Design a protein around this nucleic acid. Sequence first.
RNA 1: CCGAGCCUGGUGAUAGCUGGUUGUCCAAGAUAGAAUCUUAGUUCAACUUUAAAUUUGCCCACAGAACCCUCUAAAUCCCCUU
RNA 2: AGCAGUACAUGCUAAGACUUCACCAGUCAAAGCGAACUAUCCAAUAACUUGACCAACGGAACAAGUUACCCUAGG
Lengths: 55, 354, 95, 102, 21, 74, 85, 120, 51
Amino acid sequence: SKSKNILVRMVSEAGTGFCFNTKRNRLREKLTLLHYDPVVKQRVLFVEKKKIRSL
Amino acid sequence: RRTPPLGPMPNSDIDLSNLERLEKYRSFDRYRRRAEQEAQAPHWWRTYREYFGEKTDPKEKIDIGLPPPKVSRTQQLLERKQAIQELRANVEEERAARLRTASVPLDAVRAEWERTCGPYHKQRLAEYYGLYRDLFHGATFVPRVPLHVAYAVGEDDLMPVYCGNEVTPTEAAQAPEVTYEAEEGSLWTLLLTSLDGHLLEPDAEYLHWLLTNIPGNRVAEGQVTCPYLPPFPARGSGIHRLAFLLFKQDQPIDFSEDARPSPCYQLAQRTFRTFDFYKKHQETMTPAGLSFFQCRWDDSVTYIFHQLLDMREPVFEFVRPPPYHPKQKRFPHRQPLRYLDRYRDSHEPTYGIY
Amino acid sequence: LTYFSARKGKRKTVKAVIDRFLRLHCGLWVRRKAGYKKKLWKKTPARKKRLREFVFCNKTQSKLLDKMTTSFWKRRNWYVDDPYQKYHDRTNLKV
Amino acid sequence: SGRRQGIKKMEGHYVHAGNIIATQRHFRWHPGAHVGVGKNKCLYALEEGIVRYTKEVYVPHPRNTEAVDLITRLPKGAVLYKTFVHVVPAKPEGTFKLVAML
Amino acid sequence: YKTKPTHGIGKYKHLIKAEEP
Amino acid sequence: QKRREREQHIAECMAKMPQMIVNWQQQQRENWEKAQADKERRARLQAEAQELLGYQVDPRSARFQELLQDLEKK
Amino acid sequence: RLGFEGGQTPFYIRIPKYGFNEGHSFRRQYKPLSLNRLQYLIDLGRVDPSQPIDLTQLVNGRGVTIQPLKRDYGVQLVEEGADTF
Amino acid sequence: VARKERGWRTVFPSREFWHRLRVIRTQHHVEALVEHQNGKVVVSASTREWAIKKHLYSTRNVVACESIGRVLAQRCLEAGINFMVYQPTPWEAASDSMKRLQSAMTEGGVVLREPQRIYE
Amino acid sequence: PYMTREQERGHAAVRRREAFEAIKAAATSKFPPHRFIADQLDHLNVTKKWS
RNA sequence: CCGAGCCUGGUGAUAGCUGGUUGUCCAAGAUAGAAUCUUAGUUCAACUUUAAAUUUGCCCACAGAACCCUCUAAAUCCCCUU
RNA sequence: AGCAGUACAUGCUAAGACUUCACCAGUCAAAGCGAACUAUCCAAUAACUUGACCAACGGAACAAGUUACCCUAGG
Ligand SMILES: [K+]
Ligand SMILES: [Mg+2]
Ligand SMILES: [Mg+2]
Ligand SMILES: [Mg+2]
């Protein structure tokens, strides 16, 4: 029901569709990251989309 | 079971009774200064210096050079102390140092350096480059006589040789201009040798240039025992050492045995060993000056091989040992599929009997 | 394992083995790592990479898999554009 | 309930590049010449050669706060020592081979 | 190693005065 | 056609990425600076302490935050 | 029974399922005929180059063996021996 | 292609170099050395030398450290030494003396960074 | 001891190596024995009788 | 002998654990571990058989393997020669 | 101990090794590319993926008492 950290899926803004799960604090706003995107072979903005599991 | 130490153990003099009263390092630099000193010292236990440090003869290197010049330390110290007091007296000197605007004349420094510490720094450089190891089989001399070798590159420019600087074979196409301080009546021998150029014998050298019985600084008047030949480092063979050696003769010497034809384009006739050449003339001549440069292949070398040497240009490549793999096993348990590629010689599909 | 089927009196293949293993004609068996698709979030990149490798079975396992499959699964095959074609034959193996 | 950690390669043993020389929970043997360290303090060979164990003076990195504090508090004249493992390269990097006679 | 003559070459806590936390 | 649509979709989004990254980095620095002010905001409350030893909740310290909000309002 | 370890999950069960053999029975197969084999067959008079060479002549000369029941779809000519063909 | 002595990760300084610049500052003098990883000293410049000392008001100040860099850079080029590593401590790097000495070396043609080894 | 450890070193090396070569040579010479016709035909004498 | 009759068939039913298991000779041949609704059983290990291929195996010189306080001795690992 | 901090190239790929040991699983890693340059099956999902305190933790998909009326089994 509650956890210190949340597992959430980050989707690339490039629209390639590459996504990677990441850990963020439960009491935080939607996370945005410059994670590397294999499809485009360079760093790209990643937007938090869907909650996967609670740790 | 305990074995007594085979010598003084480290940190044993330290008196532990009054630990608080002892003076601590208090700084990383002070500990490091002591640490480096301790590392240099010899130890009974196994050390990195043993396995990796070079093994060289304990007996001191024989000195085969000219005797050191005689200097009066009392007078030298007197003049130097007075010179510094004169320099420090100037208010402008103190202001320039305080404001960090002062500088040293590099040209004046090198002029004095050549007279004072330069011979000993050139010896250190020659030792580091292996010239003594390869030319005199470990014997060392201090180049007391500064030898100035410069290659005329074009009409108005000169490429100097400064004990290891790189000179291309193109710049060394013609004989260089050689100058040195020699008193009247003296006789000198100048040779140019390629330590790493020999294509057939590992320990042999090439005699590129040999001038003998040079009267004073008049190198042009010296007998041409061996005509000048440009350095021809083979392509892909790396960087080669080219060393000018100046010898101070004690009297006129007969070099007919070492003579070579003019022009000499046979590599067999230019095969040379400085140790053997000096050994036969050690009584009459002493190594006086030393200059050398580093040379690698350039387009001009191809001309030397095809035209001057009338041979095909040899090309070399740096080849590394084949990668090590363990002996292949019939069942490579837990190994990836690509394990079988490590032992595969052909990438194209095979069909066997079919 | 069925050594003599009720209707044909022939040995049978264990289909569980066919689902999980690839047999190279040289006698090697290829498999996947257990859990390569599970809980990737809590696995390091190095662990994830070795989990997705195709690995060989040991001698003992290979002989057991051979008994559990009939001769049909050991025949040489000539599939067009087979990814494992080159691995069917061993090279430079002294033994 | 026990595990195996310690020296995989003893003094004088021949190792290939990548061989794990030793595994340790804490630094008991320190990396010497041509010996790499893993994330878990594993010691492995970076070159092919013979393994050697020696005692070398220990000087920590200036930014290793914990270790720098120790050496600064030592009595002057006292030098820390540690056990280091080295690999003596057995083979040369390569050789120059004649490939053409243009 | 204990048996070897060089046993204890790297002991340092005796050099440092012990401090209680 | 499907390949081209995906290829064009990626190209269009990638074109806008450099500007988006720059704008994103600005909002990061903006919040990065707000965090710095947050540290000093508590320090300002301590300035109003007037030699108060107690570390307990202080009415003036909480009130000053409301007063700061009143100062902001205009 | 064989494949039973006495209680634990058997090795052949605890390995995950992967489609190594999925659809194997429907994959097309081609017997490889090399230029070495083809040249060898011609040299020994078992395939005559003066007439069209097809599967029938290759099979009749015992040059290749085709198993249609084993999903063989014919012969695939391979480049092995091209240098000496 | 020559192998650098990798390792020594837990100690300072690193041995992964062919040549390094080492600066020794004493109470009265400044010395800068260029030495091979094997411990041999290739070239060196020191304020103890009369050639340098006579042109210096002080041999322990920033100007002396800058002058040593300019002199050492010239000797380096003459010896064919173009690349080396400099392994200072945090305080040494920040100090103005080493900044001026490093600038003189770079303005003299020395890169102060070595090319990576070519393994393949 | 008649010799010290240093002097003993390598004195038996040559014999110790050659002895192993004999062991190796025996261990690599295993092969099925020759088969002879006379052995097979000799079995016909089981029915040999006086005329 | 009915806490659920008897008979036939399913049925040579299953499990569990005992017991039994039939001429001679020669060669090799005794280990003591891990998982399991598993500890009265099993399968991977330990030892063991036959054949085959190849090259070292055993014994063991020096050197070498940590600090932290080691009861610290008796020993171990590694290891040329023999 | 059944976690947390805090980063988001915990990217890709690849020699050679370690390992409680048997298996399964687990662990380290040069070079290179690109950067920086300091359990099983099952069930949900387009995909990427996620989920059993399966704690009897090598886990049967899912089941208790009682027999002093007892039945059968060997030790
Ligand atoms: K040569
Ligand atoms: Mg017997
Ligand atoms: Mg041995
Ligand atoms: Mg790398």
